[PDB]
Amino acid sequence: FISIGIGALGAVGGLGALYALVRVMLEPSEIAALGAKTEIDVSKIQPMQVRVTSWKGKTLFAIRLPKDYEILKGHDVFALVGVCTHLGCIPLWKPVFHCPCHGGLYTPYGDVIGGPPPRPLFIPPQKLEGNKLI
Amino acid sequence: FISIGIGALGAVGGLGALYALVRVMLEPSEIAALGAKTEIDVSKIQPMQVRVTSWKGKTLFAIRLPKDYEILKGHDVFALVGVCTHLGCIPLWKPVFHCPCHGGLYTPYGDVIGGPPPRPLFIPPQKLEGNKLI
Amino acid sequence: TWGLIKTIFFAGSTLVFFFLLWFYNPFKHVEHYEVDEEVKAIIDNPWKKTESGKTIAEEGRELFIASCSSCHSLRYDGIYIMSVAANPKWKNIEKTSGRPVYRFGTLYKDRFFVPKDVYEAFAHDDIQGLKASLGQVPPDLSSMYLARGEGYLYQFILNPQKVLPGTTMPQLFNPQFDPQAKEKVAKIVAYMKSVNTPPPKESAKRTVMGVIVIAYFIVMGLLLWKYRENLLKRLG
Amino acid sequence: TWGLIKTIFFAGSTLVFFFLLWFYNPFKHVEHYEVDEEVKAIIDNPWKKTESGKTIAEEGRELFIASCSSCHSLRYDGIYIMSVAANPKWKNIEKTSGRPVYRFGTLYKDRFFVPKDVYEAFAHDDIQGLKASLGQVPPDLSSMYLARGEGYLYQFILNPQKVLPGTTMPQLFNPQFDPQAKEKVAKIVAYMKSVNTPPPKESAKRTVMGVIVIAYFIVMGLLLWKYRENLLKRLG
Amino acid sequence: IVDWIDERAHVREIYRTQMVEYKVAKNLTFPYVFGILALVTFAIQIISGMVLILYYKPSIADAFDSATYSIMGEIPFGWLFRHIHATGANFFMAIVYLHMFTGIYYNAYKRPRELVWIVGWLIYFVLILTALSGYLLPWGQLSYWGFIVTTEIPGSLADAPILKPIFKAIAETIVLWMKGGYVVTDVTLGRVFGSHVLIYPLILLALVGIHLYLVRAAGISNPEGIEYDKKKNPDKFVPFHPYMTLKEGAYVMWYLAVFFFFVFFHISHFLPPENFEPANPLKTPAHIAPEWYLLGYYEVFRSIPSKFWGFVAFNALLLLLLLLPFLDFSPLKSARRRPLFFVMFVIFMISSMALTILGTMPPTPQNAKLGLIFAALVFAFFISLPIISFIEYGW
Amino acid sequence: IVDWIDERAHVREIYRTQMVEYKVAKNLTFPYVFGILALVTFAIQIISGMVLILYYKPSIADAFDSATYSIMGEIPFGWLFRHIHATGANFFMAIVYLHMFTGIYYNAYKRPRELVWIVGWLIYFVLILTALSGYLLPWGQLSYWGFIVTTEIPGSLADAPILKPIFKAIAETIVLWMKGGYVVTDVTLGRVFGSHVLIYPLILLALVGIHLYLVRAAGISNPEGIEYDKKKNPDKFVPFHPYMTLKEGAYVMWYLAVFFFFVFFHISHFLPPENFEPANPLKTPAHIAPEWYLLGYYEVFRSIPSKFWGFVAFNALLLLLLLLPFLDFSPLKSARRRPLFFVMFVIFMISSMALTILGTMPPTPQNAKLGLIFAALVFAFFISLPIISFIEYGW
Ligand SMILES: CCCCCC/C=C/CCCCCCCCCC(=O)O[C@H](COC(=O)CCCCCCCCCCCCCCC)COP(=O)(O)OC[C@@H](O)CO
Ligand SMILES: CCCCCC/C=C/CCCCCCCCCC(=O)O[C@H](COC(=O)CCCCCCCCCCCCCCC)COP(=O)(O)OC[C@@H](O)CO
Ligand SMILES: CCCCCC/C=C\CCCCCCCCCC(=O)O[C@H](COC(=O)CCCCCCCCCCCCCCC)COP(=O)(O)OC[C@@H](O)CO
Ligand SMILES: C/C(=C/CC/C(C)=C/CC/C(C)=C\CC1=CC(=O)c2ccccc2C1=O)CC/C=C(/C)CC/C=C(\C)CCC[C@H](C)CCCC(C)C
Ligand SMILES: C/C(=C/CC/C(C)=C/CC/C(C)=C\CC1=CC(=O)c2ccccc2C1=O)CC/C=C(/C)CC/C=C(\C)CCC[C@H](C)CCCC(C)C
Ligand code: HEC
Ligand code: HEC
Ligand code: HEM
Ligand code: HEM
Ligand code: HEM
Ligand code: HEM
Ligand code: FES
Ligand code: FES
């Protein structure tokens, strides 16, 4: 038929044009997801060594410690978003590791022992499957 | 009066708004004229020495030679837009001075003696008033 | 009448709302810093001439370059770190746009504005001992006057430990044993103010034209009102 | 009839005008360069696999990096000068956007695209012996395939003195005594082509959707025509 | 002359039809001029944005140096057109708020004006997006962070409700829509610039055209509520020109004087000083609540102790302005005519000002108690419209 | 349903008035669809430019890497919307040329359509600027240099005439207008981007609206020349819908098929390959004539051995399209009705195609002889319109 063929075909055309326009404008996909995996081989890092990385943006720390806030008990591996709190610097490693901007100290777990910062370093959500962190 | 006051005053307001809009959009003045003077002290340059400068953009040469195309006879000072011709490089000084991109030679006056370039270096318009070139 | 109460309520509450929403919300208690009033006049007029025919803005500029450009890069006026001196090109700063500073309304062909990405990639992306030692790159003082105010700028400088409790920015001017330090910080802040504030010649034309535009719109509205009122009598 | 002559003239001349204005103007005699046909198949399919499971595009990439990245910086694929190696950061190339190369439609997290101003200010604005010696900076091969064509690229490379009479770009592959040089230049041009041309998987979806859009508009116009013609009989 | 143009365009036949015999009402009160003023401010925004688009550069390393160095110091009269733009944005929100609030007063949403209110609510929604996306463009310290906090709000929907915690990765306006996905990069700033500059003002020109046509097709509602004595009762209409086209002609000039007072002499609050610091994504400012036209909803949000229910309230408070004409069903029209709706409208207007004011203050628990007390009263205005309707339906 | 929207918007009353009882002519030939097609291509350009504005960055070091790297490789379907844009620009010039040329054929500029032709010539002039300024934006090798050579043309006015050599520094469109003054810098590219993207398409939307209104107010001219048998003679009109609204509905689809053939399968001439080299201001390409819609005037120019007189001819050839309705004064209307105007129009159309074709070839002296022979015939069409009018005025 015709009077319904025009409608069906116009709907198909509008759907294709809309798909293209949404795909161009509203789509950062497959380049936005950087990075959900965040490959962090924890078989390389030696104890009491942290790595600079990025999970959902900058930055990310990957601490590894054999023995002894504290949301998580001893797993010997985790990850913490490393940015100083009260003004936003980057603390450098080495038990505590402080940021040289003002003097804020931080335990290897993330809490603050002597605080110019008011709050600790937030635990970003993570996942460990074998020898990989998320 | 009133019915003419509104017209006079609306014309003044439209003229002011138009002046502002033209002054914002269509006006590179006093930063566009860089550079019409192009201060080139020719009391410093020693004979057979050229200077890198800019007249109406890049680039400009300022040659000074005591003795011997040739649009201009002996004035001992002039200026030539220095960019190689057949592909657009910058020849370096030293009687001829060539550009090392393909081997084009140029007399101290501007013409080509052995030409991968077809045409010489153009004489940009200039003005000499005392110890200054334009 | 009841319409009068309706009017002075629906307009009263609206004016009171936009008043304490658009200036002087009395329930926000942000802190204020005052200039020490030992000078308060070095800063009020940075274009005030001094001896040797140099304005306070210029004296503050050279004081900033000499004792403050060691770690801070006030662009918008061509002042970058002195490591190297000067930190931008070295060799050619002109062929990077890179353009000369042309502020209101005069240009300075001796100082150049290099973009934020060309600089700090050619300059500090080989991170010298600024982000390393301090941990904090000394950010940029190009528009820090507009963001802080002369009070905060004067009170921060010469006592950075007062404003922020701990801070690796040094005192660099310690009073109670330096008689000229207050005037030094005053000339520094006067310079930083002269970068973001139009000179008295340009700052007065703005006031004149702002008064004239408002007076133009008021009188044009008033003429339209009188015209309508005179025309409505020809018709009723 | 006279209307028929009017039609086949005002449409004939218009089609003949837009034909020799929009493709094959036979009066412009620009010169053409041909691939030597000794291969002509290394270039037609750069994604053609080879031994060791490496495509011709990849072999050309490493050949370009090894013997051509000495002076040319093919960005859009993360290949900058080898002085220094690699010329971009050194230290951190990631915090300059600086983003990873994400071409159609796969990204390479190992190679980074640095802007034209960050690069060549951090890299070559301390002019090493490239603009100095050659006088000409070796420009950029990122989009030189699209600008020259595989014929011109193959004929320029391996005999730069043929195309341009004098040129300080060296032969760098001299035939008549090198049996593999033609295949080397062929793999180089195949790589440079694989940077600007979508792979066969993506280049075929474009053809399919281009055929389908044209077939959609033709058939939609034809259905509108038939609808109008059937409706005009209900009315006359 | 002009007769030559009349014989070809019929301009005088359009004038004597659209202005001389338009027959507006006579008793139109002052707040009817807010539409004309919103249109004038729209023109101001377009005119001063066509100037800023010449010199603003949508790169992270180039923005805030275009707007603050280039526009303000380098360009002649560029300071003026950035002042005009940042002032017109706030004046354009304020005028549109007054417009819809005492278009609510006169119940200009009832029949036959249901459609003009739908188109007006679309205007309002896309105007929030045009002012919200244009605030990221200066790339200032609190511009960037108010954009972050404003686009992290739909992430609270992905928060687990008490039931059905599947919304994670559902309606992910965080990674899909603005914020570009985990990072605000150069591509995201380019996208926000392009949208704010051309995509939103075009679908505002279209929507304002449709709105202005629907106002004419439905006729402007008079503040009495009787809505007509048409074909009869002269001396009640006194046609548009010049009884109303010079009254608006003067109110527009006075509004422009009030506007150019803020443009020139008091703009320390439209270009806030603390936005003159270049944005760095590692340092968060102290108090980063959104801009004032969204604080009325930001105080409803972050007052419910849960985030998901706070987002649901955020969105129900917006959706109850769309469904407002379908929510109020009564023969009576104005608020002069409904003595019980006037009380609820005073409550609603007071509690909507109070939420916007409480949204500026820091989030103390007493502030949250107040923000709940006032959110309850703002919702009581919408929950009571059908009850008032049932009461008036029986007279 | 839809009746609910009709009672509030009166959409069916607008349909049955604008489409069912519009009463177009019946004998409208095919070239009357060129206006509808120009409007469709305008929509195509706006739609695909709203996409390119998201990712194009108006910086000298960033442009050509947005357009060539970002748009083409990084963005999904970005290749398609750059192909659509560069194809729509050339199709939009071609359609507008056909539109005005056989709107000249049917003499749709005579009374009472003098004003619609003036507005159409304004459309054409601002469209040259929108396509000329949008070509600089890719910042390619020949984009930049064709912009340079095109804006250096008004400098030939500053050239000394044989008399009064005062024009130097007079109408200095070199330093004042585009080219930014002695250098095309980042500020000039920002200015051209802003103008091309928003200032010119807005004053094209305004002008196209005015043009479409003036066409309706004056009525569409029929190709016979009698221009009416109105209030009488049925069976000559057969109203617009659906006799003409589905004929155009099909011609638009077929034109879009021809358009999307070039978009997909043959675009090596709209995005010319030699424009994929980043512009460097030190290397001039070999042949740098402007883009094809300006070659008809570029061949008149640079054919007169003088530059000043060449510029005067360049501008007189444009101005004689504005004054074309005032230049032709006759009762007769169509070219079917004037056997002596048809000959001059064939001469004009042939000699206007021939100039555009000769403008592509390199400037040999024989090419200049031909470009003068054809410029003379193009001017003879305008110099003969008043003579033909005097002849026809006496029948
Ligand atoms: C140099 C400095 C400047 C100097 C001063 C400038 C001039 C100022 C003039 C006043 C401007 C404000 C205008 C107030 C409105 C006029 C008052 C009014 O008219 O009252 C009502 C107006 O309604 C209406 O717009 C309703 C009123 C608007 C509602 C208030 C807006 C609230 C905004 C809140 C925004 C956040 C809320 C959204 C988030 C939930 C209607 O009353 P009526 O029953 O019809 O009777 C009218 C009388 O004349 C009787 O004849
Ligand atoms: C996949 C590949 C695609 C496949 C093919 C696609 C389809 C193509 C179809 C043809 C498209 C071209 C249309 C040609 C116009 C139709 C011909 C025509 O109709 O002829 C005349 C058209 O006028 C007019 O537009 C005048 C004609 C336009 C003039 C020519 C334009 C010149 C352009 C020059 C541009 C540079 C000049 C400017 C610089 C000075 C009018 O003739 P009539 O006397 O009224 O009699 C009409 C007959 O039907 C008799 O009944
Ligand atoms: C610098 C500022 C910008 C300038 C831009 C300029 C643009 C346009 C300028 C031209 C303005 C048009 C003025 C014409 C006024 C109409 C006069 C009129 O009133 O015309 C009427 C009909 O027009 C009608 O329907 C017409 C009504 C139907 C269409 C209404 C428009 C719909 C909404 C459009 C807005 C944008 C839509 C979205 C676009 C994508 C009357 O027609 P009659 O046959 O006699 O009687 C029939 C009965 O209706 C009697 O009432
Ligand atoms: C041509 C066209 C085709 C789109 C084809 C599509 C998406 C195919 C689906 C995707 C396909 C296959 C495969 C998947 C796919 C294809 C790729 O090429 C691709 C490329 C790069 C990365 C990834 C991909 C990818 O994933 C776009 C149309 C042109 C526009 C400008 C769209 C905007 C249109 C609007 C806004 C409405 C305007 C309609 C107007 C009123 C005309 C009415 C007449 C008719 C339309 C009914
Ligand atoms: C406020 C305003 C004032 C302009 C004031 C001017 C230039 C004064 C002249 C310049 C003066 C003193 C001194 C010289 C001068 C002043 C500087 O500030 C300055 C700053 C920096 C460098 C150099 C200078 C300088 O040289 C601009 C108006 C706002 C606009 C957006 C303009 C665009 C307007 C358009 C397009 C028409 C719209 C009209 C509209 C329909 C309303 C109708 C009602 C009424 C207007 C009749
Ligand atoms: C020894 C390094 C150093 C030098 C020299 C230095 N500063 Fe600082 N300054 C810093 C650092 C690091 C910061 C930013 C982080 C911090 O310390 O608070 C800063 C911040 C600032 C701030 C703003 C801080 C804020 O949060 O608003 C100002 C203003 C400032 N400096 C002014 C100056 C002036 C003026 C001088 C020259 C007299 C100067 N600085 C010299 C280290 C320095
Ligand atoms: C010893 C320096 C040098 C090296 C190594 C070099 N080139 Fe060149 N090449 C140049 C220079 C300089 C230019 C540009 C000016 C010129 O010489 O023509 C150039 C230009 C080019 C051009 C384009 C010229 C035009 O006008 O279109 C191409 C293509 C090219 N080179 C490819 C290559 C390839 C492929 C390699 C690696 C096999 C390479 N180049 C290695 C010096 C070099
Ligand atoms: C129509 C309603 C509009 C509103 C409510 C609005 C609002 C805003 C706001 C609040 C800003 C921030 C300015 C600042 O904080 O300094 C802004 C910036 C900007 N606007 Fe708009 N805008 C509107 C329309 C437009 C239009 C039509 C354009 C056309 C180009 C435009 C162009 C810009 C540009 C380029 C900027 C950034 C320049 C700057 O930082 O000042 N805007 N807008
Ligand atoms: C750019 C934004 C807007 C513009 C330019 C605009 C313009 C106008 C104008 C000129 C009128 C004429 C009647 C009058 O002046 O009161 C009007 C009427 C109206 N507007 Fe808007 N408006 C805008 C936004 C809105 C919004 C956001 C709403 C509702 C949420 C709205 C709802 C209405 C209603 C209900 C009327 C009818 C009033 C009545 O007939 O009594 N408008 N609009
Ligand atoms: C209306 C008539 C228009 C014409 C004739 C036109 C013509 C052109 C042309 C020829 C180009 C060069 C593209 C290339 O060579 O690759 C271009 C580029 C461009 N146009 Fe337009 N344009 C028009 C409208 C618009 C509009 C409304 C926009 C709205 C944003 C726009 C945005 C752009 C942008 C951003 C570019 C540069 C992007 C690129 O390099 O492809 N154009 N235009
Ligand atoms: C974006 C550009 C343009 C658009 C969208 C446009 C659109 C239209 C449309 C739809 C018509 C209806 C009648 C018809 O289809 O033939 C028309 C008529 C007309 N146009 Fe345009 N046009 C444009 C440019 C021009 C130009 C550049 C000229 C002249 C230089 C022009 C001159 C005319 C004339 C004379 C008519 C009346 C034809 C007649 O009534 O016989 N138009 N235009
Ligand atoms: S940021 Fe670490 S000390 Fe203030
Ligand atoms: S550029 Fe100097 S030789 Fe070709």
Numbering used by the authors:
A (entry chain A), B (entry chain D): 8 to 75, 96 to 121, 131 to 170
C (entry chain F), D (entry chain C): 3 to 238
E (entry chain E), F (entry chain B): 7 to 401
Quote the study on this structure.
Cellular respiration complexes convert redox energy into a transmembrane electrochemical proton gradient, which is used to synthesize adenosine triphosphate (ATP) or to transport various substances. In summary, we solved the 3.3 Å structure of respiratory complex III from the hyperthermophilic chemoautotrophic ϵ‐proteobacterium Aquifex aeolicus and revealed the structural basis for the hyperstability of proteins in an extreme thermal environment. Several residues unique for thermophilic bacteria were detected that provide additional stabilization for ligand binding and for the structure of the whole complex.
We also determined the cryo‐EM structure of the cytochrome bc1 complex from A. aeolicus with the Qi site inhibitor antimycin A (AMY). The entire structure of the inhibited enzyme complex is identical with the native structure, except for the Qi site. H, but in the structure with the inhibitor, it is replaced by AMY, suggesting that this inhibitor competitively occupies the Qi site and prevents the entry of the substrate NQ, thus blocking the electron transport and the entire respiratory chain reactions. There are five hydrogen bonds seen between antimycin A and cyt. b. In contrast, previously only the head group of this inhibitor was reported to be bound to the Qi site.1d, 2c, 16 It is possible that this location represents the NQ channel from the Q‐pool, in which the substrates are transferred into or out of the catalytic center.
